[PDB]
Amino acid sequence: VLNDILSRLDPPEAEVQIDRLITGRLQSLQTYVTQQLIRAAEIRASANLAATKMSECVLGQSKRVDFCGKGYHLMSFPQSAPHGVVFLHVTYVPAQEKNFTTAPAICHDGKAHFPREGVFVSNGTHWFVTQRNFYEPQIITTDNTFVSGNCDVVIGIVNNTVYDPLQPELDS
Amino acid sequence: KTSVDCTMYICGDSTECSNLLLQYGSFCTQLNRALTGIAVEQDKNTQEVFAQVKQIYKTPPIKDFGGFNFSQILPDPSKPSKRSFIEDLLFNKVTKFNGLTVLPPLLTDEMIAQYTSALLAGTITSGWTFGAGAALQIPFAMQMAYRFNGIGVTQNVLYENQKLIANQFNSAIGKIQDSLSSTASALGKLQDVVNQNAQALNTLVKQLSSNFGAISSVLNDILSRLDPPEAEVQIDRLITGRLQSLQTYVTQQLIRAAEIRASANLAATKMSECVLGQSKRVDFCGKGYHLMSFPQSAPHGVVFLHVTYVPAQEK
Amino acid sequence: KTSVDCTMYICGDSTECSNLLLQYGSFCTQLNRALTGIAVEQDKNTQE
Amino acid sequence: DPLSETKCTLKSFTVEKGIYQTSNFRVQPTESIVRFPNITNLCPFGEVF
Amino acid sequence: CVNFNFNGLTGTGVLTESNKKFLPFQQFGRDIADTTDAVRDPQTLEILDITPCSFGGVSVITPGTNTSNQVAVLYQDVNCTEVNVFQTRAGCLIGAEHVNNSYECDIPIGAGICASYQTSQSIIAYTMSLGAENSVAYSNNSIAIPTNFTISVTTEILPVSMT
Amino acid sequence: CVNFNFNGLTGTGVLTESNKKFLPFQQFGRDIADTTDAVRDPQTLEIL
Ligand SMILES: *[C@@H]1O[C@H](CO)[C@@H](O[C@@H]2O[C@H](CO)[C@@H](O)[C@H](O)[C@H]2NC(C)=O)[C@H](O)[C@H]1NC(C)=O
Ligand SMILES: *[C@@H]1O[C@H](CO)[C@@H](O[C@@H]2O[C@H](CO)[C@@H](O)[C@H](O)[C@H]2NC(C)=O)[C@H](O)[C@H]1NC(C)=O
Ligand SMILES: *[C@@H]1O[C@H](CO)[C@@H](O[C@@H]2O[C@H](CO)[C@@H](O)[C@H](O)[C@H]2NC(C)=O)[C@H](O)[C@H]1NC(C)=O
Ligand SMILES: *[C@@H]1O[C@H](CO)[C@@H](O)[C@H](O)[C@H]1NC(C)=O
Ligand SMILES: *[C@@H]1O[C@H](CO)[C@@H](O)[C@H](O)[C@H]1NC(C)=O
Ligand SMILES: *[C@@H]1O[C@H](CO)[C@@H](O)[C@H](O)[C@H]1NC(C)=O
Ligand SMILES: *[C@@H]1O[C@H](CO)[C@@H](O)[C@H](O)[C@H]1NC(C)=O
Ligand SMILES: *[C@@H]1O[C@H](CO)[C@@H](O)[C@H](O)[C@H]1NC(C)=O
Ligand SMILES: *[C@@H]1O[C@H](CO)[C@@H](O)[C@H](O)[C@H]1NC(C)=O
Ligand SMILES: *[C@@H]1O[C@H](CO)[C@@H](O)[C@H](O)[C@H]1NC(C)=O
Ligand SMILES: *[C@@H]1O[C@H](CO)[C@@H](O)[C@H](O)[C@H]1NC(C)=O
Ligand SMILES: *[C@@H]1O[C@H](CO)[C@@H](O)[C@H](O)[C@H]1NC(C)=O
Ligand SMILES: *[C@@H]1O[C@H](CO)[C@@H](O)[C@H](O)[C@H]1NC(C)=O
């Protein structure tokens, strides 16, 4: 207690006592300030991360994997909180899945057909082309698939027929 | 995960020194608390960097990966700790009782190897789906077709050049093997980290040999030689000096741990956006268009093998 | 890219002050080490 | 008890789940030993008395 | 463990038969970090290694006092001889029932060992599990495609500012 | 606000009639910082 030292000693040695006290308290203050500075650097890093998430997650739609919630990111909603923010990340997650036999491409007339968007699948007997994130089987035609070269090079090709929409119209 | 016992470091086996030290309040409590926080933070860093897969997938015995050869990154069933070739290279290319202790990491290297194996098997046998949700198998050729579509190159390019791409990938992996086996400095960063810490500790220990203005750096000699009235001042000097040295060491550790936390956050982001998926951020996952990545453990660190696509012959 | 001379700052041109300072051990060399590290970090920042 | 040790070291009557460090176990020295070279040297007091 | 005072030096530690070959004129050893390592006994021409006496932190593993008051004690980095006892790479654990079944880590101990309060109820220490294993039925002409889906809202919390 | 000195304990501050339920043997209170908080008047049986 500084008051006790001032009330109990004259300046000649009160100065030494107060010097010791001042040195101790100054060291404590410096330690506290350094701790605060390092923690503020931590919080600044977290705040930059939060700002980046708000920019690229709320004001848009991030395709960065796992950066905006587990699964495929749909959107985000921000919420305040005492000295922080809370993101509700709305994401799309496939739930029910089925096995299928698949082929990278199919011959029709020697030429090979590759799917524009989606993959070829077979339920055992027939072959469809379905988008790769949701089983939506569609008949294989020349507007779902594009030709390239011939089917002596691709590995794993399977035979099938590629229905052509223009042929029935031409016949009719 | 270093931890220092201030009472034994400052006042090794000396009741009077401890009584004098007890005047300085709660310095030890906050120093020990900071070091404990550092250790906890390191555990959290490793946990978040690696423990990103809900399950532990394992590759099937068949290696019909469209011609791709992963035998240099998948675990070796006949190996010291089920580590892959590149993992073992990384582990082999990186190299007391005075109140200083080294707490063990929560996740042993075997567990980190298992985590990298699970992530790698998921990436190989399911692509990116295993990150989003349930793992959905897919032939590797079709996964690479997805990736090529992802980089604006139509898929037929792959299927017409499948063997060439597989051979090029194998050659690249072999070149990486040779580079890692030949040049030890490649893992510099990791080594550097280790080095720095050691130096810190050494410096701290060397501070026990400084008199800080006292008559001798040895506490016992001061106690046995001088009378208590002046030995008290001498031990006050020694305690101030040793406390200042400890504070400097703790502050340096805090700053270096902030650096390492930033590095670990960057590594976690890279693993999430690079391995579990396919990044479209330029120069964030290797020079060129990014195709995929493979993680590999390392002592207190991670190593990404970035597989990327680079146009070569221009007309 | 600052750099501070510990001995010359604390004990500018004085043998006795330097001899008293060197009793504290490595309280000076590590400051120079840190500042050189800072300078190298700046150069690496610019090059990156 | 160690639980009370944790209670005081945290300055609270209630402790949340976790692992805390409270003190240091150190084996104490059972006895003391003093070692010096052989007392070969001898002052010539026998000559005088 | 003895408190010793050789010719001019004093310290505390355990003296053990050494493996070094001191020169005929060397007395006190020294480690790399300017620490006494071995000494030459003044009477017997034998070199004694000085290993400082065992010590380590005493961690108290506890479930929250709200639920129960039973605790376990971990003596860090010591054998269980110098103290239902578990010898782990982290040290000696007392009061923890060692089980074989793996579970998610609750109170981390170290070296892959975590402790927790579980069922009649007691504290157990176990090698933490990384998750249920699984095998993907991968084959060169098989693809698994989803048929349904779920919209999941997750929660990510980030601190922004201090006081 | 006055410069007070009770039985040798010196301080500066305002003295306000306190509602604290001091026990008959307690002479004065303290704050967590080891500083006086409330005192019982030596001359009058009052706590402030
Ligand atoms: C695979 O899908 C095809 C197309 O839906 C199935 O073929 C049809 O089966 C229904 C009976 O469920 C018939 O009414 C249609 O005439 C069939 N169409 C064709 C073009 O064949 C086929 O049965 C399915 N196979 C399996 C094993 O489920
Ligand atoms: C898809 O059908 C064609 C027929 O149009 C198959 O081509 C035949 O291949 C055999 C070799 O297995 C040859 O002996 C025949 O001469 C080929 N026929 C023609 C008309 O070229 C082709 O093999 C089938 N694909 C698969 C995977 O069985
Ligand atoms: C994947 O590549 C590795 C080498 O990069 C192959 O292993 C080699 O196999 C040959 C033939 O038995 C041996 O002579 C070499 O010594 C092996 N090298 C190593 C490093 O093991 C491996 O066989 C390849 N995988 C497949 C499926 O072919
Ligand atoms: C696909 O077949 C495998 C057989 O190896 C089976 O284990 C798996 O459950 C099947 N997929 C689904 C969605 O049932
Ligand atoms: C796929 O693997 C089977 C063995 O299970 C083999 O018979 C078949 O030829 C393979 N197909 C391709 C395209 O490699
Ligand atoms: C294209 O033409 C320029 C000059 O017109 C020439 O310098 C360049 O080498 C050419 N590109 C290639 C690939 O040869
Ligand atoms: C010291 O004296 C003891 C007996 O008192 C003897 O055994 C020992 O050899 C002596 N040592 C030397 C170096 O003379
Ligand atoms: C003198 O000799 C006697 C033996 O009679 C012996 O006891 C004594 O110690 C000797 N004096 C001194 C000073 O050594
Ligand atoms: C303590 O446990 C009770 C259940 O008996 C629960 O209602 C309460 O919220 C718990 N308190 C804390 C602080 O965990
Ligand atoms: C603990 O015991 C093991 C074998 O029981 C032994 O190898 C080890 O040296 C002991 N620990 C110490 C500090 O001596
Ligand atoms: C655990 O399994 C080992 C064999 O792997 C056995 O020796 C030990 O008794 C078992 N302990 C318990 C508690 O089941
Ligand atoms: C998808 O899951 C929901 C459960 O939320 C279920 O009600 C629905 O029938 C499922 N759809 C299909 C096609 O199975
Ligand atoms: C003297 O002090 C006593 C007790 O402190 C008190 O009761 C009394 O009134 C005081 N006398 C005067 C004249 O104030």
Please, which residues have CB within 8 angstroms of residue A47's CB and are 6 or more apart in sequence? Answer: E158, E159, E160, E161
Would the CB of A161 count as within 6 Å of ligand 2? no
Contact E154 A130 (CB under 8 A): no
Cα–Cα dist A105/B147, whole Å:
17
Cα–Cα dist A111/A161, whole Å:
11
What are the phi and psi torsion angles at F6 (to 5°)? -100, 110
What is the rounded radius of gyration, in angstroms, for the C-alpha atoms of chain D? 27
Which residue, chain included where needed, has tokens 């107060």? A18
Handedness of CA F16, F19, F25, F29 (dihedral sign): negative
Give the other-Cβ count within 10 Å of A2's Cβ: 12
Please, which residues have CB within 8 angstroms of residue A138's CB and are 6 or more apart in sequence? Answer: A118, A128, A129, A130, A144
Cα–Cα dist A109/A99, whole Å:
29
Question: Taking CB atoms and an 8 Å cutoff, what residues of chain B touch A46?
Answer: none
Cα–Cα dist B276/A134, whole Å:
20
Question: Taking CB atoms and an 8 Å cutoff, what residues of chain B touch A153?
Answer: 159-160
User: CA angle, B246 as apex, B48 and B14 as ends, to 5°?
Assistant: 125
* Distance between first and last Cα of chain F: 13
CA distance, residue A53 to nearest chain F CA (Å): 43
Of A1, A6, A7, the CB nearest to F34: A1
Q: Which two tokens mark A149?
A: 């070269």
Ligand sitting nearest the alpha carbon of D43 = 8
Q: Which two tokens mark C14?
A: 């004085």
Do E85 and E92 form a contact (C-beta atoms < 8 A)?
A: yes
Query: In the PDB record, what is the listed experimental method?
Result: cryo-EM
Which among C25, E37, E52, E16 has a CA at the least distance from the CA of B8? E52
Question: Taking CB atoms and an 8 Å cutoff, what residues of chain A touch E149?
Answer: 92-95, 134
The distance from CA A143 to its chain's CA centroid, rounded to whole angstroms, is: 32
Q: Which two tokens mark E53?
A: 């006496």
CA of E30 to the centre of ligand 7 (A): 26
Q: Name the closest residue on chain F to residue A5, using Cα atoms.
A: F10
Which amino acid is present at C48?
Answer: E
Q: Name the closest residue on chain D to residue B35, using Cα atoms.
A: D21
Element (H, E) at A129: strand A127-130
Which amino acid is present at E77?
Answer: D
SS3 category, C25:
coil
Cα–Cα dist B203/B282, whole Å:
42
Residue minimizing CA distance to atom 14 of ligand 12: E148
Q: Which residues pair with E49 in a beta bridge?
A: E16, E38
User: CA angle, B215 as apex, B209 and B221 as ends, to 5°?
Assistant: 75
Do F22 and F47 form a contact (C-beta atoms < 8 A)?
A: yes
User: CA angle, B284 as apex, B283 and B287 as ends, to 5°?
Assistant: 30
Which among F13, F43, F47 has a CA at the least distance from the CA of F27? F47
Of A46, A97, A99, the CB nearest to E159: A46
DSSP string covering A28-90: HHHHHHHHHHHHHHHHHHHHHHHHHHIIIIISS---STTBTBSSEEEEEEEEEETTEEEEEEE
Q: Which residues pair with E122 in a beta bridge?
A: E118
Please, which residues have CB within 8 angstroms of residue E146's CB and are 6 or more apart in sequence? Answer: A94, A95, A96, A97, A98, A133, A134, A135, B133, B134, B136
Q: Name the closest residue on chain E to residue D37, using Cα atoms.
A: E42
Alpha helices in B2-108 (DSSP H): 6-10, 15-21, 27-50, 85-92
Alpha helices in B76-214 (DSSP H): 85-92, 109-126, 129-132, 140-150, 156-160, 162-182, 188-206
Would the CB of A150 count as within 6 Å of ligand 2? no
Torsion of CA A76, A79, B41, E99, to 10 degrees: -80
Handedness of CA B26, A26, C34, B258 (dihedral sign): positive
Contact F35 A7 (CB under 8 A): no
Ligand sitting nearest the alpha carbon of D14 = 9
Cα–Cα dist A147/A112, whole Å:
6
Distance (Å) of CA D29 to CA E6, E37, E49, E83? 16, 18, 17, 15
Residue minimizing CA distance to atom 4 of ligand 4: E137
Residue minimizing CA distance to atom 19 of ligand 2: A110
| Ordered strands of the E91-94 beta sheet | D18-26, E55-62, E72-76, E91-94, E85-88
Q: Which two tokens mark F36?
A: 């006086």
Contact E151 A92 (CB under 8 A): yes
Give the other-Cβ count within 10 Å of B104's Cβ: 19
Contact D26 B8 (CB under 8 A): yes
Chains in contact with chain D (at least 3 beta-carbon pairs closer than 8 A): B, E
Contact E53 D29 (CB under 8 A): yes
Do F14 and F26 form a contact (C-beta atoms < 8 A)?
A: no
Q: Which two tokens mark E11?
A: 């310290």
Distance (Å) of CA A91 to CA A58, A71, B275, E36? 13, 6, 19, 62
Would the CB of B283 count as within 6 Å of ligand 6? no
* B129 CB-contact burial (10 Å; exposed 0-12 / middle 13-18 / buried 19+): buried
Cα–Cα dist A67/B272, whole Å:
7
Residue E136 is classified by DSSP as -
SS3 category, B231:
helix
What are the phi and psi torsion angles at B141 (to 5°)? -60, -40
What are the phi and psi torsion angles at B175 (to 5°)? -65, -40
Contact A3 F11 (CB under 8 A): yes
Q: What b/e string do you get for C7-35 counting C-beta neighbours within 10 Å, with b at 16 or more?
A: beebbeeeeeeeeebeebbbbbebbeeeb
Would the CB of F43 count as within 6 Å of ligand 13? yes
CA of B312 to the centre of ligand 6 (A): 14
Cα–Cα dist B2/A8, whole Å:
45
Please, which residues have CB within 8 angstroms of residue B125's CB and are 6 or more apart in sequence? Answer: B57, B59, B60, B135, B137, B138, E136, E138
Q: Name the closest residue on chain B to residue E109, using Cα atoms.
A: B106
DSSP string covering D24-39: EEEPPP-EEEE-----
CA distance, residue A47 to nearest chain F CA (Å): 34
Which among E100, E107, E21 has a CA at the least distance from the CA of E62? E107
SS3 category, E87:
strand
Element (H, E) at D7: helix D2-9
Contact A135 E147 (CB under 8 A): yes
Would the CB of E140 count as within 6 Å of ligand 5? yes
Which residue, chain included where needed, has tokens 């082309």? A129
Half-sphere exposure of E157 (CA within 13 A, CB side): 4
Which among E118, E61, E63 has a CA at the least distance from the CA of E95? E61
Do A18 and A10 form a contact (C-beta atoms < 8 A)?
A: no
Cα–Cα dist B206/B217, whole Å:
11
User: CA angle, B239 as apex, B238 and B243 as ends, to 5°?
Assistant: 120
Parallel/antiparallel/unpaired status of strands B301-309 and B289-298: antiparallel
Do A157 and A140 form a contact (C-beta atoms < 8 A)?
A: no
Residue minimizing CA distance to atom 9 of ligand 8: D46
Q: Name the closest residue on chain D to residue B12, using Cα atoms.
A: D26
Cα–Cα dist B270/B112, whole Å:
17
Of D21, D24, D26, the CB nearest to B36: D21
Residues of D contacting chain B (CB within 8 angstroms): 21, 24, 26
Which residue, chain included where needed, has tokens 């006892």? E85
Long-range contacts of F9-13 (CB under 8 A, 24+ apart): F9/A3, F9/F36, F9/F39, F10/A3, F10/A4, F10/A6, F10/A7, F11/A3, F11/F36
Which among B12, E8, B13 has a CA at the least distance from the CA of D35? E8
Cα–Cα dist E117/A136, whole Å:
49
| Ordered strands of the E107-110 beta sheet | E97-98, E122-127, E113-118, E107-110
Give the other-Cβ count within 10 Å of A126's Cβ: 11
Give the other-Cβ count within 10 Å of E11's Cβ: 18
Q: Which two tokens mark A10?
A: 């004259």
Q: Which two tokens mark E149?
A: 């889906």
Handedness of CA D12, D14, D18, D24 (dihedral sign): positive
Using a CB–CB cutoff of 8 Å, tell me whether B167 touches chain A.
Answer: no
Residue minimizing CA distance to atom 27 of ligand 1: A124
Using a CB–CB cutoff of 8 Å, tell me whether B210 touches chain C.
Answer: yes
Would the CB of A159 count as within 6 Å of ligand 2? yes
3-state SS, F1-33, equals CEEEEECCEEEEECCCCCCCCCCCCCCEEECCC
Which amino acid is present at B301?
Answer: G
SS3 category, B289:
strand
Cα–Cα dist E8/E100, whole Å:
54
Question: Taking CB atoms and an 8 Å cutoff, what residues of chain B touch C17?
Answer: none
Which amino acid is present at B302?
Answer: V
Cα–Cα dist E119/E67, whole Å:
13
Do D and E make contact, counting contact as 3+ CB pairs within 8 angstroms?
yes
SS3 category, E156:
strand
SS3 category, E163:
coil
Cα–Cα dist E130/E103, whole Å:
8
